[PDB]
């Protein structure tokens, strides 16, 4: 291999949540917002170079739901075993005071694809300019996910990426500080 393009989809019950995305060498090209029925390019620039009929994706998710029900029954209602995420917090760039950076909360190797991620600055939740990716597929078929918190490095701030997942008894907090 040189490259691998994967159209990954999933449907989860009872959550009734679904996802449809394209992955290139591990990076998300785009995913479909099934409610707004729009293609969400991982990098805006992508939308200027290619196109995709987001709505076509609902056909797949509809089949996936149908298949899930068939398989659910076939497995005699065997549920998924939660697999807790290993969480890592790093910066996207070397840290320098007064130089904007981004805290990256890498949530890896987990399932089911449902997680609550909160950023805490000095023990308090911070939402300012945060962003995240949808659930990215792994070759072992667990999931990866990224959460981002732009921030201005300070010797007086401490951060924590708090991750809630059914594989964990309590929220997992990954700390970061200058």
């Amino acid at each position: 291999e040189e490259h691998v393009i994967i159209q990954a989809e999933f449907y989860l019950n009872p959550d009734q949540s679904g996802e449809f995305m394209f992955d290139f060498d591990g990076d998300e090209i785009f995913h479909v917002d099934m409610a707004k029925k729009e293609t969400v390019w991982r990098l805006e620039e992508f939308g200027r170079f290619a196109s995709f009929e987001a709505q076509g994706a609902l056909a797949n998710i509809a089949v996936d739901k149908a298949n899930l029900e068939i398989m659910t029954k076939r497995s005699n209602y065997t549920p998924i075993t939660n697999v807790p995420p290993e969480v890592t917090v790093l910066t996207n760039s070397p840290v320098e005071l007064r130089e904007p950076n981004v805290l990256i909360c890498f949530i890896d190797k987990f399932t089911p694809p449902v997680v609550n991620v909160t950023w805490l600055r000095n023990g308090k939740p911070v939402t300012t300019g945060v962003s995240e990716t949808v659930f990215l597929p792994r070759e072992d078929h667990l999931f990866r996910k990224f959460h981002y918190l732009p921030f201005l490095p300070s010797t007086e701030d401490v951060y924590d990426c708090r991750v809630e997942h059914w594989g964990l008894d309590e929220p997992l907090l990954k700390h970061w500080e200058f």
Partner: protein, 181 residues
Amino acid sequence: GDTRPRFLEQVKHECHFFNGTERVRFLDRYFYHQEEYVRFDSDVGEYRAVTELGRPDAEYWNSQKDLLEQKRAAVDTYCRHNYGVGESFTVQRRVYPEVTVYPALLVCSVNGFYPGSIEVRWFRNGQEEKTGVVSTGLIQNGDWTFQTLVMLETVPRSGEVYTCQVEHPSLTSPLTVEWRA
């Protein structure tokens, strides 16, 4: 917390490319939770159950000739087609790395590059350092950029010159950052 049973269905339509699009392998994979139960491998040409729970599907799907016909043409109408469509901003994507050297133990942080293929070497007085070099490995930032840190444990001599050199597809020649003790 919510302990209600969860049931997950995953489907992955994979396109594996070799030497450009010379060789392409298409995989139509179906998973129940994390367990793949049925798949269509273009190198095989038909759906094959991966677990007994898949047999039912592999049978009904191979029974549809218009269906197998579609899947067998997938390497072209799907994989090669999409490869062509996204080639310029995926396959040809080249973002150069920024290299930062700072005293930790010297740290060479290479950031924001794409693709992942990269070579980062530590030099001391013009000689490559092999022993005492540790790398965090390739790190995917999740935004189509990578980063990696290569550390060098050393004891500089008077005015010792350390050099972090990076080679990457985006650059014509190595990118060098020299730090003098």
